[PDB]
């Protein structure tokens, strides 16, 4: 007909830029004396309890793994990172002009307020802490932005409840996202897990060596990949078909650890909606939020 | 009839940057430099290609190189030197007549503008590429001939007039329009924030255990001298329908966007060179473009 197609190398750079997270040990009422949690190595002998075959059930299983605990005289895990939000979300890093420009035009009425609120809420509710949230006496999140400090505790993680301080931070974040500039939130999390509690750093892929589990380290200190924090932050999509709990923003709504994709094969993926928005079709408020959330995520959205 | 160009006519590059090293400092304690080291990390992602949604339920593991400022330093320090070398009309390999009449045809080239735009690309920090995004402030320090110059607040995409840029460009044009050489020694300080991702040059390795590999020198994150150089010679605003400056390439090629703003419309270096040697006249900006291609270096022969 006369359709406008996206260039082969249309690519957007990411706009939520978290750092790596470092993991320290403190006591809940002495947060100035911090000590780094160090990754160790231990032996693990196990059992061949795999569903398929009971003929191996009497055989052993010797492995060596990385592990990471709080020391036996500190009761609190402290997780530190920064999240820099950057503007100009609609200026493609690689794609040309025409397609991306009319896409920006089709997206200009996007509810940046809700996007920024859900981002900052995930940061404040401590979703970025993943399994470290489990079994915590209390959880205290501290976000410092523009020499201003905010503290959170009583936040439900899987609902975007309205909170006035989350809203005040989301105001600056949405100001940046819907326009130009950048703003850095400096984040600390305090979890009262108990002395000697196991902590959960990012895990590495070791295809070579004697380790079967390998934990992420920086100079030997337990740490979480910046991309894992980022994935937790963008868990804002409640708009896929038959949506229940929020999923991370992905062009196909993929959650690979569950082997499913909530936006694949039903014309609700990023590329279908994108080509619709460029070629005259109208987008919902939630569809515009989703397409803009993908433009914030970054990636190559070109013909492949 | 026509002065054909010798088959092996070639010029050597005249703007010689070094490789850039990447350190981490604090913005207000620049005498405590520590080096940024390239690391390796696992990265797990989704199969999110435009084509196939049938793989949208499948994941993928990779290992990649990565480079961060420490969590106790907030400023990236990029260091390099650039040596400008004169005799930009003496050919390296080509014979005599074509090169000599070309040297005569271009003795009225605006060397002031060339030197200014080179020095400006160095001072505005274009050479930093993606390390410019998200800076609270950028401070460039250029030392030359026992004279130190500091720059903050320079628009990268405009050649605004600046007195220090012009004063350095004066020596640079004195070398480029005559003989000799001169070394500018350049530092860039960027207030990015503690723990910020920094962007060294990327490598290509056919099949390796690494999916994405960063340029290192003894393990320290670094930038290729040719990338700094490509930023330095982004001065071409004279192709047809010119928006922003592009890097000086004989066909005005920008392979990252799959177009060549001087290919196939009698604006390429070879057409202009043939014209200049074979009697035809060039614009002032065309003389600038041809001399910039001679300063870039390369083979201009069959």
Coordinates of C-alpha atoms in Angstrom, one line a residue:
Chain A
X1 CA 0.0 0.0 0.0
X2 CA 1.8 3.1 1.3
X3 CA 3.0 2.1 4.8
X4 CA 5.9 3.7 6.7
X5 CA 8.3 1.0 7.8
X6 CA 10.9 1.3 10.6
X7 CA 14.5 1.5 9.5
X8 CA 16.7 -1.6 9.7
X9 CA 18.7 -0.2 12.6
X10 CA 16.2 1.7 14.7
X11 CA 17.6 1.6 18.2
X12 CA 17.0 3.5 21.4
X13 CA 19.4 3.9 24.3
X14 CA 18.3 3.2 27.9
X15 CA 17.0 6.0 30.1
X16 CA 16.8 4.4 33.6
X17 CA 20.5 3.9 34.4
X18 CA 21.1 2.1 37.7
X19 CA 24.5 1.3 39.0
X20 CA 25.7 -1.9 40.5
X21 CA 24.5 -2.5 44.0
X22 CA 26.9 -3.1 46.8
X23 CA 26.0 -5.2 49.8
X24 CA 27.2 -4.3 53.4
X25 CA 26.5 -5.5 56.9
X26 CA 25.4 -3.1 59.7
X27 CA 23.4 -3.3 62.9
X28 CA 19.9 -1.8 62.7
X29 CA 20.7 1.0 65.2
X30 CA 24.4 1.6 64.2
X31 CA 24.2 2.4 60.5
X32 CA 27.5 4.3 60.4
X33 CA 29.8 1.4 61.1
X34 CA 29.4 -0.6 57.9
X35 CA 31.4 -3.7 56.8
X36 CA 31.3 -5.3 53.3
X37 CA 29.7 -8.7 52.8
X38 CA 32.4 -10.9 51.1
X39 CA 31.6 -13.8 48.8
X40 CA 33.0 -17.2 50.1
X41 CA 33.4 -20.7 48.7
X42 CA 32.0 -23.8 50.3
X43 CA 31.5 -27.5 49.6
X44 CA 27.9 -28.9 49.1
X45 CA 27.1 -32.6 49.0
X46 CA 23.6 -33.4 47.8
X47 CA 21.2 -35.8 46.4
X48 CA 20.0 -36.8 42.9
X49 CA 16.3 -35.9 43.4
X50 CA 15.5 -35.1 39.8
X51 CA 11.9 -35.9 38.7
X52 CA 12.7 -38.0 35.6
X53 CA 14.8 -40.9 36.8
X54 CA 14.7 -42.6 40.2
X55 CA 17.5 -45.0 39.2
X56 CA 20.0 -42.2 40.3
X57 CA 18.4 -41.6 43.7
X58 CA 21.0 -43.6 45.5
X59 CA 24.0 -41.7 44.0
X60 CA 25.8 -38.7 45.3
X61 CA 26.4 -35.2 44.1
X62 CA 29.5 -33.2 45.2
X63 CA 29.7 -29.5 44.2
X64 CA 31.4 -26.3 45.2
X65 CA 29.4 -23.1 45.4
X66 CA 29.8 -19.4 46.3
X67 CA 27.8 -18.2 49.3
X68 CA 27.3 -15.0 51.1
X69 CA 26.1 -14.3 54.6
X70 CA 25.8 -11.5 57.1
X71 CA 28.5 -11.8 59.8
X72 CA 27.4 -13.3 63.2
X73 CA 27.6 -9.8 64.8
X74 CA 25.6 -7.8 62.3
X75 CA 21.8 -8.2 61.8
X76 CA 21.1 -5.9 58.9
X77 CA 21.8 -6.1 55.2
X78 CA 22.5 -2.7 53.5
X79 CA 22.1 -2.5 49.7
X80 CA 23.4 0.7 48.1
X81 CA 23.0 1.9 44.5
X82 CA 22.1 4.9 42.3
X83 CA 19.5 5.3 39.6
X84 CA 20.0 8.1 37.1
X85 CA 17.0 9.0 35.0
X86 CA 17.8 10.6 31.6
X87 CA 15.4 12.6 29.3
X88 CA 15.0 12.9 25.6
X89 CA 13.3 9.5 25.6
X90 CA 11.9 9.9 22.0
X91 CA 15.2 10.7 20.3
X92 CA 16.4 7.4 18.8
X93 CA 20.0 6.6 19.3
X94 CA 20.3 4.9 15.9
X95 CA 17.2 5.0 13.8
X96 CA 16.7 7.8 11.3
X97 CA 14.2 10.6 11.5
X98 CA 10.8 10.1 9.8
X99 CA 9.6 6.9 11.5
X100 CA 10.9 7.8 14.9
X101 CA 9.7 11.4 14.6
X102 CA 6.1 10.5 13.8
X103 CA 6.3 7.9 16.5
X104 CA 7.3 10.6 19.0
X105 CA 4.3 12.7 17.7
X106 CA 1.9 9.8 18.2
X107 CA 3.3 9.3 21.7
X108 CA 3.4 12.9 23.0
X109 CA 0.2 12.6 25.1
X110 CA 1.8 9.7 27.2
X111 CA 1.0 9.6 30.9
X112 CA 4.6 10.1 32.0
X113 CA 3.2 10.7 35.5
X114 CA 2.1 7.0 35.9
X115 CA 5.4 5.8 34.4
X116 CA 7.5 7.8 36.8
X117 CA 5.3 6.9 39.8
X118 CA 5.6 3.2 39.1
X119 CA 9.4 3.4 38.6
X120 CA 10.0 5.3 41.8
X121 CA 7.5 3.1 43.7
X122 CA 9.3 0.0 42.7
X123 CA 12.5 1.7 43.9
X124 CA 10.9 2.7 47.2
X125 CA 9.0 -0.5 47.9
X126 CA 12.3 -2.3 47.6
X127 CA 11.3 -4.6 44.7
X128 CA 14.9 -4.2 43.5
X129 CA 15.9 -6.3 46.5
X130 CA 14.5 -9.5 45.0
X131 CA 14.9 -12.5 47.4
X132 CA 16.6 -10.3 49.9
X133 CA 13.1 -9.1 50.9
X134 CA 12.2 -12.5 52.4
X135 CA 12.1 -12.9 56.1
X136 CA 12.9 -9.3 57.1
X137 CA 11.9 -7.9 60.5
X138 CA 11.5 -4.5 58.9
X139 CA 12.7 -2.8 55.6
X140 CA 13.7 0.8 55.5
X141 CA 14.4 2.5 52.1
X142 CA 16.2 5.8 51.9
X143 CA 16.2 7.8 48.7
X144 CA 18.2 11.1 48.4
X145 CA 17.4 13.4 45.4
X146 CA 18.6 17.0 45.1
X147 CA 19.9 17.1 48.7
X148 CA 16.5 16.0 49.9
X149 CA 15.9 12.7 51.8
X150 CA 12.9 10.4 51.9
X151 CA 12.3 7.3 54.0
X152 CA 9.9 4.4 53.4
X153 CA 8.7 1.4 55.3
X154 CA 5.0 0.5 55.1
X155 CA 4.8 -0.1 51.3
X156 CA 3.0 -2.9 49.6
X157 CA 5.2 -4.1 46.8
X158 CA 2.8 -5.7 44.3
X159 CA 0.3 -2.8 44.4
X160 CA 1.0 0.8 43.4
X161 CA -0.6 2.3 46.4
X162 CA -0.7 6.1 46.5
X163 CA 2.0 7.7 48.6
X164 CA 2.8 11.3 48.8
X165 CA 6.6 11.1 49.0
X166 CA 6.8 8.5 46.2
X167 CA 4.7 11.1 44.3
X168 CA 7.0 14.0 45.1
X169 CA 10.0 12.1 43.8
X170 CA 8.0 10.8 40.8
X171 CA 7.3 14.5 40.0
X172 CA 10.9 15.2 39.3
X173 CA 11.4 11.9 37.6
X174 CA 8.5 12.5 35.2
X175 CA 9.7 16.1 34.7
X176 CA 12.9 14.6 33.3
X177 CA 11.3 11.7 31.4
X178 CA 8.7 13.9 29.6
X179 CA 11.3 16.5 28.7
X180 CA 15.1 16.9 28.9
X181 CA 17.8 16.6 31.5
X182 CA 18.7 13.9 34.1
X183 CA 18.2 13.3 37.8
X184 CA 20.0 10.8 40.1
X185 CA 18.3 9.1 43.0
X186 CA 20.8 7.8 45.6
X187 CA 19.3 4.7 47.2
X188 CA 20.0 2.7 50.4
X189 CA 18.0 -0.3 51.6
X190 CA 18.1 -1.6 55.2
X191 CA 16.8 -5.1 55.9
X192 CA 16.7 -6.6 59.4
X193 CA 17.3 -10.2 58.5
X194 CA 19.2 -11.5 61.6
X195 CA 22.8 -12.3 62.4
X196 CA 24.3 -14.8 60.0
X197 CA 21.4 -14.6 57.5
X198 CA 22.0 -15.7 54.0
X199 CA 22.0 -12.8 51.4
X200 CA 21.3 -13.2 47.7
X201 CA 23.7 -11.5 45.3
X202 CA 23.5 -11.7 41.5
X203 CA 24.5 -15.1 40.1
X204 CA 27.0 -15.7 37.3
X205 CA 27.2 -18.2 34.5
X206 CA 30.3 -20.4 35.0
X207 CA 30.6 -22.8 32.1
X208 CA 34.4 -23.4 32.7
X209 CA 35.4 -24.0 36.2
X210 CA 34.9 -26.1 39.3
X211 CA 32.1 -23.9 40.7
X212 CA 28.5 -24.9 40.0
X213 CA 27.1 -21.7 41.6
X214 CA 29.0 -18.5 41.2
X215 CA 28.0 -15.2 42.9
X216 CA 28.6 -11.8 41.5
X217 CA 31.5 -9.9 43.2
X218 CA 33.3 -6.6 43.0
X219 CA 36.7 -6.8 44.6
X220 CA 35.4 -9.8 46.4
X221 CA 32.3 -8.0 47.8
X222 CA 28.9 -9.4 47.1
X223 CA 27.0 -7.3 44.6
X224 CA 24.0 -7.3 42.3
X225 CA 24.1 -6.6 38.6
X226 CA 22.8 -3.2 37.6
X227 CA 20.6 -4.9 35.0
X228 CA 18.8 -6.9 37.7
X229 CA 18.0 -3.7 39.6
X230 CA 16.9 -2.2 36.3
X231 CA 14.6 -5.2 35.5
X232 CA 13.0 -4.8 38.9
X233 CA 12.5 -1.1 38.4
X234 CA 10.7 -1.4 35.1
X235 CA 8.2 -4.0 36.5
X236 CA 5.3 -1.7 35.7
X237 CA 3.3 -3.4 33.0
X238 CA -0.3 -4.2 34.3
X239 CA -1.8 -3.7 30.8
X240 CA -1.2 -7.0 29.0
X241 CA -4.2 -9.3 28.1
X242 CA -5.8 -10.6 31.3
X243 CA -3.2 -8.8 33.4
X244 CA -3.0 -9.7 37.1
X245 CA 0.4 -8.9 38.7
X246 CA 2.8 -6.4 37.0
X247 CA 5.5 -7.8 34.7
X248 CA 8.7 -6.2 33.5
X249 CA 8.4 -4.1 30.4
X250 CA 9.5 -6.2 27.4
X251 CA 8.6 -5.8 23.7
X252 CA 6.8 -9.2 23.9
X253 CA 6.0 -9.1 27.6
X254 CA 8.3 -12.1 28.1
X255 CA 9.0 -13.7 31.5
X256 CA 11.5 -16.4 30.5
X257 CA 11.9 -17.8 34.0
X258 CA 8.3 -18.9 33.7
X259 CA 8.5 -19.9 30.0
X260 CA 5.6 -17.7 28.9
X261 CA 5.1 -14.4 27.1
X262 CA 2.0 -12.3 27.8
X263 CA 2.2 -10.0 24.7
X264 CA 3.2 -12.5 22.0
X265 CA 0.9 -13.6 19.2
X266 CA -2.1 -11.4 20.0
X267 CA -1.2 -8.1 18.3
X268 CA -0.4 -6.4 21.7
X269 CA 3.4 -6.5 21.3
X270 CA 5.7 -3.5 21.0
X271 CA 6.3 -3.8 17.3
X272 CA 2.6 -4.2 16.3
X273 CA 1.5 -1.2 18.4
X274 CA 4.5 0.8 17.2
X275 CA 3.7 0.3 13.5
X276 CA 0.1 1.0 14.3
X277 CA 0.9 4.3 16.0
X278 CA 3.2 5.4 13.1
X279 CA 0.7 4.4 10.4
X280 CA -2.3 6.5 11.6
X281 CA -3.9 4.0 14.1
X282 CA -4.9 5.3 17.6
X283 CA -3.4 4.1 20.8
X284 CA -4.9 3.7 24.3
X285 CA -3.5 5.5 27.3
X286 CA -2.1 2.2 28.5
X287 CA -0.8 1.3 25.0
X288 CA 1.0 4.7 24.8
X289 CA 2.5 4.1 28.3
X290 CA 3.7 0.6 27.1
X291 CA 5.3 1.9 23.9
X292 CA 7.0 4.7 25.8
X293 CA 8.1 2.3 28.5
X294 CA 9.8 0.3 25.8
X295 CA 11.4 3.4 24.3
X296 CA 12.7 4.0 27.8
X297 CA 14.0 0.4 28.2
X298 CA 16.1 0.7 25.0
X299 CA 16.9 -1.9 22.4
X300 CA 16.9 -2.5 18.7
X301 CA 13.4 -2.2 17.3
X302 CA 14.3 -2.6 13.6
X303 CA 13.6 -5.3 11.0
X304 CA 15.1 -8.7 11.8
Chain B
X1 CA 45.0 15.4 -21.8
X2 CA 43.8 14.6 -18.3
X3 CA 46.2 14.4 -15.4
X4 CA 45.3 10.9 -14.2
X5 CA 46.0 10.3 -10.5
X6 CA 48.9 7.9 -9.9
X7 CA 47.6 4.5 -8.9
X8 CA 49.3 4.6 -5.5
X9 CA 48.8 8.3 -4.5
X10 CA 48.4 8.2 -0.7
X11 CA 48.8 10.7 2.2
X12 CA 49.7 9.9 5.8
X13 CA 47.4 11.1 8.6
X14 CA 48.3 14.5 10.1
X15 CA 46.1 14.5 13.2
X16 CA 47.6 11.8 15.4
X17 CA 45.7 11.1 18.6
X18 CA 46.9 8.5 21.1
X19 CA 44.8 5.9 22.8
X20 CA 42.8 7.4 25.7
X21 CA 43.0 6.0 29.2
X22 CA 40.1 6.1 31.6
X23 CA 40.6 6.9 35.3
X24 CA 38.3 7.7 38.2
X25 CA 38.8 10.7 40.5
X26 CA 36.6 12.8 42.7
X27 CA 35.6 16.1 41.2
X28 CA 37.3 18.1 43.9
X29 CA 40.4 15.9 44.4
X30 CA 41.9 15.4 41.0
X31 CA 45.4 14.4 42.2
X32 CA 44.1 11.0 43.4
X33 CA 43.6 9.1 40.2
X34 CA 42.7 5.5 40.1
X35 CA 42.4 3.5 36.9
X36 CA 39.1 2.1 35.6
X37 CA 39.5 -1.7 35.0
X38 CA 37.5 -3.7 32.5
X39 CA 35.5 -6.5 34.2
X40 CA 33.5 -9.5 33.0
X41 CA 29.9 -10.2 34.1
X42 CA 27.1 -12.5 33.1
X43 CA 24.1 -10.9 31.4
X44 CA 20.7 -12.7 30.9
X45 CA 18.1 -11.4 28.6
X46 CA 15.0 -12.0 26.5
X47 CA 14.7 -12.9 22.8
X48 CA 13.1 -9.6 21.8
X49 CA 13.8 -9.3 18.0
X50 CA 11.3 -7.6 15.7
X51 CA 10.9 -10.7 13.5
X52 CA 10.1 -13.8 15.5
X53 CA 7.6 -13.8 18.4
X54 CA 7.9 -17.6 18.6
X55 CA 11.1 -17.2 20.5
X56 CA 9.6 -14.6 22.9
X57 CA 9.4 -17.3 25.6
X58 CA 13.1 -18.2 25.3
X59 CA 15.9 -16.5 27.2
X60 CA 19.6 -16.1 26.5
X61 CA 22.8 -16.0 28.6
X62 CA 25.9 -14.0 27.6
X63 CA 29.1 -12.8 29.2
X64 CA 30.2 -9.2 28.5
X65 CA 32.8 -6.7 29.5
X66 CA 31.8 -3.8 31.6
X67 CA 33.4 -0.7 33.1
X68 CA 32.2 1.4 36.1
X69 CA 33.5 4.2 38.2
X70 CA 34.0 2.9 41.7
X71 CA 31.4 3.6 44.4
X72 CA 33.8 6.1 46.1
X73 CA 34.7 8.2 43.0
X74 CA 32.3 10.3 41.1
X75 CA 34.3 11.7 38.2
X76 CA 35.6 10.0 35.0
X77 CA 39.0 11.3 33.7
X78 CA 39.7 10.6 30.1
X79 CA 43.3 11.3 29.1
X80 CA 45.0 11.5 25.6
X81 CA 47.4 13.6 23.5
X82 CA 46.9 14.7 19.9
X83 CA 49.9 15.6 17.7
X84 CA 49.3 17.8 14.6
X85 CA 51.9 17.4 11.9
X86 CA 52.5 19.8 9.0
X87 CA 53.5 19.3 5.4
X88 CA 49.9 18.3 4.7
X89 CA 50.5 18.6 1.0
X90 CA 53.6 16.4 0.7
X91 CA 52.3 13.1 -0.5
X92 CA 53.5 9.8 1.1
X93 CA 53.4 7.5 -1.9
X94 CA 52.1 9.4 -4.9
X95 CA 54.4 10.7 -7.6
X96 CA 55.0 14.4 -8.4
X97 CA 52.8 16.1 -11.0
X98 CA 49.3 15.3 -9.8
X99 CA 50.3 15.9 -6.1
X100 CA 52.2 19.1 -7.0
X101 CA 49.4 20.7 -9.0
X102 CA 46.9 19.7 -6.3
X103 CA 49.2 21.4 -3.7
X104 CA 49.1 24.5 -5.9
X105 CA 45.3 24.3 -6.4
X106 CA 44.7 24.4 -2.6
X107 CA 47.2 27.0 -1.3
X108 CA 44.1 29.2 -0.7
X109 CA 42.4 26.9 1.8
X110 CA 41.0 28.3 5.0
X111 CA 43.4 26.7 7.4
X112 CA 42.1 28.9 10.2
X113 CA 38.6 27.3 10.0
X114 CA 40.1 23.8 9.8
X115 CA 42.3 24.3 12.8
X116 CA 39.6 26.0 14.7
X117 CA 37.1 23.2 14.2
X118 CA 39.6 20.5 15.1
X119 CA 40.6 22.2 18.3
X120 CA 37.0 22.9 19.0
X121 CA 35.9 19.3 18.7
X122 CA 38.7 18.5 21.2
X123 CA 37.7 21.3 23.6
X124 CA 33.9 20.8 23.4
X125 CA 34.5 17.1 24.3
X126 CA 33.0 15.4 21.2
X127 CA 35.9 13.0 21.6
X128 CA 34.1 11.6 24.7
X129 CA 31.2 10.2 22.8
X130 CA 28.7 8.4 25.0
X131 CA 30.7 9.5 28.1
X132 CA 29.2 13.0 27.7
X133 CA 25.6 11.9 28.6
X134 CA 24.5 12.5 32.1
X135 CA 27.2 14.9 33.2
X136 CA 26.6 17.4 36.0
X137 CA 29.5 19.3 34.3
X138 CA 32.4 18.6 32.0
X139 CA 35.8 20.3 32.3
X140 CA 38.4 20.0 29.6
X141 CA 42.1 20.8 30.1
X142 CA 44.4 21.3 27.1
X143 CA 48.1 22.0 27.6
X144 CA 50.2 23.2 24.7
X145 CA 53.6 25.0 24.6
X146 CA 53.7 25.5 28.4
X147 CA 50.2 27.1 28.2
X148 CA 47.2 25.6 30.0
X149 CA 43.6 26.1 28.9
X150 CA 40.4 25.1 30.6
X151 CA 37.0 24.7 29.0
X152 CA 33.6 24.2 30.6
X153 CA 30.2 25.0 28.9
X154 CA 30.8 24.5 25.1
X155 CA 28.0 23.4 22.7
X156 CA 29.3 20.3 20.9
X157 CA 27.2 20.6 17.8
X158 CA 27.8 24.3 17.1
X159 CA 31.1 25.9 16.3
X160 CA 30.6 28.9 18.6
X161 CA 33.4 31.4 18.7
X162 CA 35.7 31.2 21.7
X163 CA 38.9 33.1 22.3
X164 CA 40.9 30.2 23.8
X165 CA 39.8 27.8 21.1
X166 CA 41.0 30.4 18.6
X167 CA 44.3 31.0 20.4
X168 CA 45.1 27.2 20.3
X169 CA 43.8 26.9 16.7
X170 CA 46.3 29.6 15.8
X171 CA 49.3 27.4 16.7
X172 CA 47.5 24.4 15.1
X173 CA 47.0 26.3 11.9
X174 CA 50.5 27.5 12.0
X175 CA 51.6 23.9 11.9
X176 CA 49.0 22.6 9.5
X177 CA 49.6 25.5 7.0
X178 CA 53.4 25.2 7.3
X179 CA 55.8 22.6 8.7
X180 CA 56.6 21.2 12.1
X181 CA 54.3 19.6 14.7
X182 CA 52.6 20.4 18.0
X183 CA 51.2 18.2 20.8
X184 CA 48.0 19.2 22.7
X185 CA 47.8 17.2 25.9
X186 CA 44.1 16.7 26.8
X187 CA 42.3 15.7 30.0
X188 CA 38.5 15.5 30.4
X189 CA 36.8 15.5 33.8
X190 CA 33.1 14.4 33.8
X191 CA 30.9 14.5 37.0
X192 CA 28.9 11.3 36.3
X193 CA 28.2 10.0 39.8
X194 CA 29.7 7.2 41.9
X195 CA 29.3 3.8 40.2
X196 CA 28.5 5.2 36.8
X197 CA 28.8 3.0 33.7
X198 CA 31.5 4.4 31.5
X199 CA 31.9 3.6 27.8
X200 CA 35.3 2.5 26.4
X201 CA 35.8 1.4 22.8
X202 CA 34.2 -1.9 21.9
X203 CA 36.1 -4.8 20.3
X204 CA 35.1 -7.5 17.8
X205 CA 36.2 -11.0 18.3
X206 CA 35.0 -13.7 15.9
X207 CA 33.9 -16.5 18.2
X208 CA 34.9 -15.9 21.8
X209 CA 33.3 -16.8 25.2
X210 CA 32.5 -13.0 25.3
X211 CA 29.5 -11.6 23.4
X212 CA 30.6 -8.0 24.0
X213 CA 34.2 -7.0 24.6
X214 CA 35.8 -3.7 25.7
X215 CA 39.1 -2.2 24.7
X216 CA 41.6 -2.4 27.5
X217 CA 45.3 -1.6 28.0
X218 CA 46.9 -3.8 30.7
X219 CA 43.3 -4.3 31.9
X220 CA 42.5 -0.6 32.0
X221 CA 39.5 0.7 30.1
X222 CA 40.5 2.7 27.0
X223 CA 39.4 4.3 23.8
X224 CA 40.8 3.6 20.3
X225 CA 43.0 6.4 19.0
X226 CA 41.0 6.2 15.7
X227 CA 37.7 6.9 17.6
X228 CA 39.1 10.1 19.2
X229 CA 40.4 11.0 15.7
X230 CA 37.1 10.4 14.1
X231 CA 35.5 12.8 16.6
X232 CA 38.3 15.3 15.9
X233 CA 37.7 15.6 12.2
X234 CA 33.9 15.9 12.4
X235 CA 34.0 19.3 10.8
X236 CA 32.2 18.7 7.4
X237 CA 29.2 21.0 7.2
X238 CA 29.6 21.6 3.4
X239 CA 27.9 18.6 1.8
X240 CA 24.5 19.2 0.2
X241 CA 21.5 19.7 2.5
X242 CA 23.9 19.7 5.5
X243 CA 22.3 19.5 8.9
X244 CA 25.1 18.6 11.5
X245 CA 28.8 18.2 10.9
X246 CA 29.9 14.8 9.7
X247 CA 33.4 13.3 9.8
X248 CA 35.6 14.0 6.9
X249 CA 35.4 10.9 4.6
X250 CA 36.0 10.9 0.9
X251 CA 32.4 9.9 0.3
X252 CA 31.0 11.5 3.4
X253 CA 30.2 8.1 4.7
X254 CA 28.3 7.5 8.0
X255 CA 28.2 3.8 8.1
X256 CA 26.2 3.9 11.3
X257 CA 23.3 5.3 9.4
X258 CA 23.9 3.5 6.1
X259 CA 24.2 6.7 4.0
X260 CA 26.9 8.7 2.3
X261 CA 26.2 12.4 2.1
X262 CA 28.7 13.0 -0.7
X263 CA 28.3 9.8 -2.8
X264 CA 26.9 10.0 -6.3
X265 CA 26.4 13.7 -6.8
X266 CA 29.8 15.1 -7.9
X267 CA 30.7 16.2 -4.4
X268 CA 33.1 13.3 -3.5
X269 CA 36.8 13.9 -2.9
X270 CA 37.8 12.2 -6.1
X271 CA 35.6 14.3 -8.4
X272 CA 36.8 17.5 -6.7
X273 CA 40.4 16.4 -6.8
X274 CA 40.2 15.6 -10.5
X275 CA 38.6 19.0 -11.1
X276 CA 41.1 20.9 -9.1
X277 CA 44.1 19.2 -10.8
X278 CA 42.5 19.4 -14.3
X279 CA 41.9 23.2 -14.3
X280 CA 38.4 23.4 -12.8
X281 CA 37.8 25.7 -9.9
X282 CA 36.7 24.8 -6.3
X283 CA 34.7 26.7 -3.7
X284 CA 36.4 27.9 -0.6
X285 CA 34.6 25.2 1.4
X286 CA 35.4 22.6 -1.3
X287 CA 39.1 23.5 -0.9
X288 CA 38.7 23.1 2.9
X289 CA 37.0 19.6 2.3
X290 CA 39.8 18.4 0.0
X291 CA 42.5 19.6 2.3
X292 CA 40.7 17.9 5.2
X293 CA 40.8 14.7 3.3
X294 CA 44.5 15.1 2.7
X295 CA 44.9 15.6 6.5
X296 CA 42.8 12.5 7.2
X297 CA 45.1 10.4 5.0
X298 CA 44.4 7.5 2.7
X299 CA 44.9 6.1 -0.7
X300 CA 43.6 8.2 -3.6
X301 CA 44.4 6.1 -6.7
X302 CA 43.0 3.4 -8.9

